[PDB]
Structure 1
Amino acid sequence: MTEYKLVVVGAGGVGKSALTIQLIQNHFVDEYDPTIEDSYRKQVVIDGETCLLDILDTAGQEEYSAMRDEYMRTGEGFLCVFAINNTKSFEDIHQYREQIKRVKDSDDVPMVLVGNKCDLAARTVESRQAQDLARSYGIPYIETSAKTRQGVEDAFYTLVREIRQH
């Protein structure tokens, strides 16, 4: 069957792991344990296709990011995650996208922009600002909450749909 290799990237603490674990394991991780490099694999049916998701959950903390580029280079699509209550994480997205372009050696890489923690009201990134960023990259913007599950399946499945367009 088809395997989709997804890679989740973004600044430390934005909820990359919590999103991936909510998708795969159906619970919310409340604590913050910084990631080095973890992988998850699950067979799912997406738009009627039985396929295998292979998801790489990467480090956002600089200290734990050694060799992240070597993990990223295998990816077929990238979830570029920021938190809607973390303006710096949103600003960081451009540098993650530049890194993606470098590791894939391409200006045309399947990606989705994800604004996580949308259950929180300390919003400093308005939807329209992120919509505009995503538009400049030619990709969709989706908001998620790893805590409530809002948008979680949609974000990952949208990334699969973006890979299918390439």
Structure 2
Amino acid sequence: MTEYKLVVVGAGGVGKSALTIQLIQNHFVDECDPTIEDSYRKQVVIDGETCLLDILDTAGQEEYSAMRDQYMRTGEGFLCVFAINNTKSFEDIHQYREQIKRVKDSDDVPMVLVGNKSDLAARTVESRQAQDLARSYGIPYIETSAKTRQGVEDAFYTLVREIRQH
């Protein structure tokens, strides 16, 4: 069947692992996954196509990795994640994007901008701020909560839908 290789990136603590686990295992982890990389697989039907999603969950740049860029090199599409209550994580997105563009040696890589932790009220990144950033990249902006599940499927499926346009 059709395999889609997705990679999740973004600043430490934004909820990359929580999002991925919510998608795959349908529960919210309130704890912090100490791993720097992990891999997941989900067989799912997306718009009438039976798909195998291979998802590489990476750690934030704050942590040293084994083979980060080599692992990332294999990705077909990227979720670029920040948290809506963490302004620095939003500001950091541009460096994550630059890293992707370098590692894929292309300025035209399928991507979705994801504002996570939408269940929290201490919001410091307003939706319209994130919409501007996504517009500058020519990509969609989607908000998620790994806690409540809001947007989680939207985010990953939207990324499959971006890959299918490229």
Shared fold, TM over 0.5: yes
Moved over 6 A (4+): none
CA distance in 2, matches of 1:141, 1:89: 15
1:62 Cα offset (Å): 2.1
CA distance in 2, matches of 1:12, 1:66: 16
Structure 1 residues 43-58: aligned runs within 5 Å: 43-58=43-58
Question: Normalized against structure 1, the TM-score is what?
Answer: 0.98
1:65 Cα offset (Å): 3.0
Any stretches of 5+ residues in structure 1 without a counterpart? Answer: none
- Which 10-residue stretch deviates more, 99-108 or 33-42? 33-42
1:42 Cα offset (Å): 1.1
- Which 10-residue stretch deviates more, 54-63 or 129-138? 54-63
Which secondary structure state, in structure 2, belongs to the residue aligned with residue 64 of structure 1? coil
After superposition, what is the alpha-carbon deviation per residue over 1:95-137, rounded to whole angstroms, capped at 9, x for unaligned? 0000000010000000000000000000000000000000000
After superposition, what is the alpha-carbon deviation per residue over 1:41-96, rounded to whole angstroms, capped at 9, x for unaligned? 11100011001000000011523334211111000000000000000000000000
Contact kept? 1:7, 1:57, Cα under 8 Å: yes
Contact kept? 1:4, 1:51, Cα under 8 Å: yes
Question: Normalized against structure 2, the TM-score is what?
Answer: 0.98
Equivalent pairs, count:
166
- Which 10-residue stretch deviates more, 34-43 or 51-60? 34-43
Contact kept? 2:17, 2:33, Cα under 8 Å: no
Contact kept? 1:34, 1:61, Cα under 8 Å: no
CA distance in 2, matches of 1:105, 1:120: 36
CA distance in 2, matches of 1:33, 1:161: 28
Which secondary structure state, in structure 2, belongs to the residue aligned with residue 43 of structure 1? strand
CA distance in 1, matches of 2:63, 2:38: 16
1:161 Cα offset (Å): 0.1
Aligned counterpart, 2:41: 41
Alignment identity in percent? 98
CA distance in 2, matches of 1:42, 1:120: 28
CA distance in 2, matches of 1:63, 1:51: 31
Any stretches of 5+ residues in structure 2 without a counterpart? Answer: none
CA distance in 2, matches of 1:34, 1:158: 27
For the structure 1 residues 60 and 34, does the alpha-carbon distance in structure 2 shift closer, same or farther, using more than 3 Å as the test? Answer: farther
1:146 aligned onto 2:146: yes
